[PDB]
């Protein structure tokens, strides 16, 4: 996969992104 | 809780790291097996050639 | 363990993950400060 | 703020890692097929010698 075409991989990356962006926006409050 | 927050973040990253390793390990598993079976064929051929020449000698 | 090429035994892979983590940890300390 | 940019950076890294790994597996597979083909040759001869 050249841009990453694997749905399992992208799912793992998106979840991490989602979880981290939430923790950070819970640390600034 | 800047220290409690950092621990949570790191546990989460530690998860992700083990998870991405499993993902890559499984992605290339068939190549790792191909190498193993063919490397087995080379052993078998090497256990026939070395037996004939020795016998031949 | 059957192969020395395998990702689980690959120090390049570990380096890349370790670096992501190191960066994220440094980055997030900056965002809080 | 967000970490999107870090992850986008990590995705390119992971793609370069995978390509690299594909190469490493490819060469090793070809190297062993060659060293495999040339074993059937020596066997093909040592059998045809005795005919
Ligand atoms: Cl890339
Ligand atoms: Cl890069
Ligand atoms: Na948002
Ligand atoms: Na660690
Ligand atoms: Na990184
Ligand atoms: Na961009």
Numbering used by the authors:
A (entry chain A): 123 to 151
B (entry chain B): 155 to 211
C (entry chain C): 119 to 151
D (entry chain D): 161 to 211
Task: Reproduce passages from the article.
Vps34, the primordial phosphatidylinositol 3-kinase (PtdIns3K) that phosphorylates the 3-OH of phosphatidylinositol to form phosphatidylinositol 3-phosphate (PtdIns3P), is conserved in all eukaryotes, and it is important both for endocytic traffic to lysosomes and vacuoles and for autophagy. The minimal Vps34 complex is a heterodimer of Vps34 with Vps15, a putative protein kinase. This Vps34-Vps15 complex is the core for 2 larger, heterotetrameric assemblies known as complexes I and II. In addition to the Vps34-Vps15 core, complex I includes an accessory pair of proteins, Vps30/Atg6 (BECN1 in mammals) and Atg14 (ATG14 in mammals).
The domain organization of Atg38 and NRBF2 sheds some light on how these proteins might function. Both Atg38 and NRBF2 have an N-terminal microtubule-interacting and targeting (MIT) domain and a C-terminal region of unknown structure. We obtained crystals using full-length Atg38 S. cerevisiae protein that had been subjected to limited proteolysis with subtilisin. The structure was solved by multiwavelength anomalous dispersion (MAD) using selenomethionine-derivatized protein and was refined to 2.2 Å resolution. The structure showed that the crystallized region corresponds to residues 119 to 211 in the Atg38 C-terminal domain. The asymmetric unit has 3 copies of an Atg38 homodimer. The ordered parts of the monomers are entirely helical, with a short N-terminal helix A (residues 129 to 150) folded back over a part of a longer helix B (residues 164 to 211). Each homodimer is strikingly asymmetric with the long helix B in one monomer almost straight, while helix B in the other monomer is bent at residue F182 at an angle of approximately 40°. The parallel arrangement of the 2 molecules in a dimer gives rise to a 4-helix bundle at the N-terminal end of the dimer and a long, parallel coiled-coil at the C-terminal end, imparting on the dimer the overall look of a mushroom. We will refer to the segment of the homodimer corresponding to the 4-helix bundle as the cap and the protruding coiled-coil as the stalk and the disordered residues 212 to 226 as the C-terminal tail. Overall, there are 2 homodimerization interfaces in the C-terminal region, one in the cap segment and the other in the stalk segment, both of which we found are important for efficient homodimerization in vivo (see below). The structure of the C-terminal region from Atg38 clearly shows the role of this domain in forming a parallel homodimer.
